[PDB]
Design an enzyme around this catalytic site. Structure first.
Site, PDB file in Angstrom:
ATOM      1  N   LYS A 120       6.925   5.004   6.478  1.00  0.00           N
ATOM      2  CA  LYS A 120       6.922   6.283   5.795  1.00  0.00           C
ATOM      3  C   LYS A 120       7.521   6.192   4.391  1.00  0.00           C
ATOM      4  O   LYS A 120       8.608   6.713   4.126  1.00  0.00           O
ATOM      5  CB  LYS A 120       7.663   7.347   6.627  1.00  0.00           C
ATOM      6  N   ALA A 141      -9.253  -3.689  -4.567  1.00  0.00           N
ATOM      7  CA  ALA A 141     -10.392  -4.420  -5.113  1.00  0.00           C
ATOM      8  C   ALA A 141     -10.679  -5.764  -4.472  1.00  0.00           C
ATOM      9  O   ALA A 141     -11.831  -6.160  -4.351  1.00  0.00           O
ATOM     10  CB  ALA A 141     -10.215  -4.579  -6.588  1.00  0.00           C
ATOM     11  N   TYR A 152      -5.380 -10.559  -9.250  1.00  0.00           N
ATOM     12  CA  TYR A 152      -6.558 -10.376 -10.100  1.00  0.00           C
ATOM     13  C   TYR A 152      -6.884 -11.631 -10.848  1.00  0.00           C
ATOM     14  O   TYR A 152      -8.045 -12.037 -10.931  1.00  0.00           O
ATOM     15  CB  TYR A 152      -6.311  -9.335 -11.173  1.00  0.00           C
ATOM     16  N   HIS A 178      -1.958   1.299  -8.980  1.00  0.00           N
ATOM     17  CA  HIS A 178      -0.816   0.782  -8.226  1.00  0.00           C
ATOM     18  C   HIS A 178       0.325   1.753  -8.413  1.00  0.00           C
ATOM     19  O   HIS A 178       0.313   2.582  -9.332  1.00  0.00           O
ATOM     20  CB  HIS A 178      -0.429  -0.597  -8.752  1.00  0.00           C
ATOM     21  N   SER A 230      10.916   7.975   1.954  1.00  0.00           N
ATOM     22  CA  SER A 230      10.639   9.412   1.969  1.00  0.00           C
ATOM     23  C   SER A 230      11.938  10.224   2.038  1.00  0.00           C
ATOM     24  O   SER A 230      12.030  11.330   1.493  1.00  0.00           O
ATOM     25  CB  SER A 230       9.747   9.772   3.142  1.00  0.00           C
ATOM     26  N   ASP A 274      -8.715  33.279   1.103  1.00  0.00           N
ATOM     27  CA  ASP A 274      -8.575  34.532   0.347  1.00  0.00           C
ATOM     28  C   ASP A 274      -8.771  34.235  -1.136  1.00  0.00           C
ATOM     29  O   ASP A 274      -8.470  33.134  -1.585  1.00  0.00           O
ATOM     30  CB  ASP A 274      -7.174  35.130   0.550  1.00  0.00           C
TER      31      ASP A 274
HETATM   32 FE    FE Z   1      -5.361  -3.339  -7.245  1.00  0.00          FE
HETATM   33 FE    FE Z   2      -7.930  39.360   0.855  1.00  0.00          FE
END
Ligand code: FE
Ligand code: FE
EC number: 3.4.21.-
Length: 689
Positions: free
Chosen positions: A73, A123, A192, A253, A259, A395
């Site tokens: 997390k 990738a 890469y 990245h 958290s 709404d």
């Molecule tokens: Fe990447």
């Molecule tokens: Fe409404």
């Protein structure tokens, strides 16, 4: 008073060294302190971070994904910004690079030697593999994906791959003894740039990399011309055509943190200092986005322009987005599972009662429709953005939020209007509803102009007829953004539980969940707002004219309603006048847009189809309506859709939220924001930027 240092996790000696140079130049600048932990792979820093051994690590979209998974997390704190050849961006294109005169197309890779950035990356893995799943001839989840890729490619370099069980996956990797196929820059073919060299050195025939990679390595156009890109339409285009020739566009990245107690503020201060001091040509003493030639992308993506703070509501799922999440989750789900999801429609029900009703709808539809639930409307919209739900009726007020987040109105609610209730409905132009201010005829002293200090009952904050329309008019006359101070006490589900706005709310039957913006709060909604006025908990109720009509004169036999009479109630006209509930056409505060179903523009057409069928079977003239299920009925509780909905109609061209809601109301909603904004509305400002 003092605040500690950010512990940065490194994955290789080269990276540690860079980090040390960073820590060193940081203190020399008398700026925020850094520390450097040493783990052996990004997957390890995820673990190190969650266990409070470290605090931060830059991760590729793909690992962000894994980092956020349950045991860890983690969440994305800051997003890197990149090149773009034009406008800097927080996204990039995954591409497939090959040499000229190799012949094969994207659909002919079977048996090719291939170079990968690393196991799990956008990738280099998640994207190419999900594109070739259809040629993998892979059972799905039970059978390891690595067994599939290993059988498809003649030999590859997928760092972080299981070279023991699947040596073909590590076979092309140049690395010393145990260095080979390492999940760090120890393996020269990692990243890469590594996947590029693996290509350029003739070790592999295709490289799965980023759009810049070629240009970063070949500064000379003459060199680049020896290369091409495999387009997903089985053609080959030049390396500069990534905009047209990419396998996908992934999010950048990101620096991830815990958290809970992740020290986001420490991390942001550090990074903010770092760009300013060592980013793009600031200094010469140390360059943050520069690395040694031997190994590239150390700690951060070489040549990134800098970072952008990622707002707080944003988690990995929302950071990545539906499109990316689906494809990633898809490589861990069976073919039958993926196709199943793509054919059903997941509705997002708000609160316990809507979910039960949704359950009925699911069972009765033979699972063409399944359900997803959340405690509030914002949560549902996020679900739609993560890709975990497909739609929900909203709404006018939340169509705005939805629209600011890129969701589009599919179909609209057409209440049982009046002209001719033949098949006109689905093509009947939506005509809106009149928002009104209701008070007891008794309290005759009360007029629009004497609301100050009076008690108020509202459908919910963010909603048209209640909130947005009255508050919009009032903010104009008081010039004040102190909304909790105009009405003495109020009930407006969604407000701060400890503010006056949540004072008259009652929660559910055992008085829990007071002020929650969902059905649990007995005073929530048009119905609840009116009730709040009836049980005399409030003095003015902001609802639509029809709400009164449907709960007075015994139509609603719930104890509190039962004995009500439309005569006991009057409307407050903007000109200080008062008209019976029937004179609303000449005594309303505004004409609002009907609620509308919303979804990703992507799923709109499907969603429409399933919905025209579903309502043809259980709608207003649904043959199985009274019989087995009525989609537009719920015992005056207005669950999922309003109980007076005749059908879900066409938009009459109004396909964007702006067109749908109209200019005025969109503007009016913008003026109010000058006072208050929402966390979703901001999370989306970043995401859709
Ligand atoms: Fe990447
Ligand atoms: Fe409404």
């Amino acid at each position: 008073a003092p605040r500690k240092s950010v512990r940065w996790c490194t994955i290789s000696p080269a990276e540690a060294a860079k980090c040390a140079k960073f820590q060193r130049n940081m203190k020399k600048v008398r700026g925020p302190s850094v520390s450097c932990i040493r783990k052996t792979s990004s997957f390890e820093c995820i673990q190190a971070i969650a266990a409070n051994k470290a605090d931060a690590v830059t991760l590729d979209g793909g690992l962000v994904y894994e980092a956020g998974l349950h045991p860890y997390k983690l969440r994305p704190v800051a997003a890197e910004v990149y090149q773009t050849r034009g406008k800097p961006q927080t996204r990039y294109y995954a591409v497939a690079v090959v040499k000229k005169g190799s012949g094969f197309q994207l659909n002919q890779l079977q048996g090719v030697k291939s170079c990968h950035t690393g196991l799990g990356r956008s990738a280099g893995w998640n994207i190419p593999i999900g594109t070739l799943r259809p040629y993998l001839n892979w059972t799905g989840p039970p059978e390891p994906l690595q067994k599939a890729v290993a059988n498809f490619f003649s030999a590859s370099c997928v760092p972080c791959a299981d070279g023991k069980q699947y040596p073909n996956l590590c076979r092309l990797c140049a690395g010393t003894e145990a260095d080979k196929c390492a999940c760090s820059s120890q393996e020269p073919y990692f990243g890469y740039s590594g996947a590029f060299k693996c290509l350029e050195n003739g070790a592999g025939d295709v490289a799965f990399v980023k759009d810049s990679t070629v240009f970063e390595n070949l500064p000379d156009e003459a060199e680049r011309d020896k290369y091409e890109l495999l387009c997903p339409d089985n053609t080959r285009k030049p390396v500069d055509a990534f905009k047209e020739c990419h396998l996908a566009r992934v999010p950048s990245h990101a620096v991830v943190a815990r958290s809970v107690d992740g020290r986001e503020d420490l991390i942001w201060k550090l990074l903010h200092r770092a760009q300013e001091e060592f980013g793009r040509n600031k200094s010469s003493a140390f360059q943050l986005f520069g690395s040694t030639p031997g190994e590239q992308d150390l700690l951060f993506k070489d040549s990134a322009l800098g970072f952008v703070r990622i707002p707080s509501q944003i988690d990995s799922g929302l950071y990545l987005g539906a499109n990316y999440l689906t494809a990633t989750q898809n490589l861990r789900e069976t073919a039958a599972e993926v196709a199943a999801r793509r054919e059903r429609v997941v509705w997002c029900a708000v609160g316990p009662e809507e979910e039960r009703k949704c359950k009925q709808w699911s069972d009765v539809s033979n699972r063409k429709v399944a359900c997803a639930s959340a405690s509030t409307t914002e949560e549902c919209i996020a679900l739609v953005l993560k890709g975990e739900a497909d739609a929900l009726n909203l709404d006018g007020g939340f169509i705005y939020v939805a629209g600011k987040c890129g969701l589009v109105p599919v179909l609209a609610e057409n209440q049982k209007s009046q002209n001719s209730n033949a098949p006109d409905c689905v093509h009947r132009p939506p005509e809106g509803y009149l928002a009104v201010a209701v008070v007891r005829k008794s309290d005759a002293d009360l007029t629009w102009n004497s609301l100050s200090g009076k008690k108020s009952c509202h459908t919910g904050v963010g909603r048209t007829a209640a909130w947005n329309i009255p508050m919009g008019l009032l903010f104009n006359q008081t010039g004040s953004c102190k909304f909790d101070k105009f009405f003495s006490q109020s009930c407006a589900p969604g407000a701060d539980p400890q503010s006056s706005l949540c004072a008259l709310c009652v929660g559910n039957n055992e008085n829990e969940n007071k002020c929650m913006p969902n059905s649990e709060e007995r005073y929530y909604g048009y119905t609840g707002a009116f009730r709040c006025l009836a049980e005399k908990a409030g003095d003015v109720a902001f609802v639509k004219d029809v709400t009164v009509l449907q709960n007075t004169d015994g139509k609603n036999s719930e104890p509190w309603a039962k004995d009500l009479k439309q005569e006991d109630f009057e409307l407050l006209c903007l000109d200080g006048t008062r008209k019976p509930v029937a004179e609303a056409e000449s005594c309303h505060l505004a004409r609002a847009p009907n609620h509308a179903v919303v979804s990703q523009s992507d799923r709109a057409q499907h969603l429409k189809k399933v919905l025209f069928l579903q309502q043809d079977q259980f709608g207003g003239n649904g043959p199985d309506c009274p019989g087995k299920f009525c989609l537009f009925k719920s015992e005056t509780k207005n669950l999922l859709f309003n109980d007076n909905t005749e059908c879900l109609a066409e938009l009459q061209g109004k396909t964007t939220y702006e067109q749908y809601l109209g200019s005025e109301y969109v503007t009016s909603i913008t003026n109010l924001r000058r006072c208050s904004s929402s966390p979703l509305l901001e999370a989306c400002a970043f995401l859709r930027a």
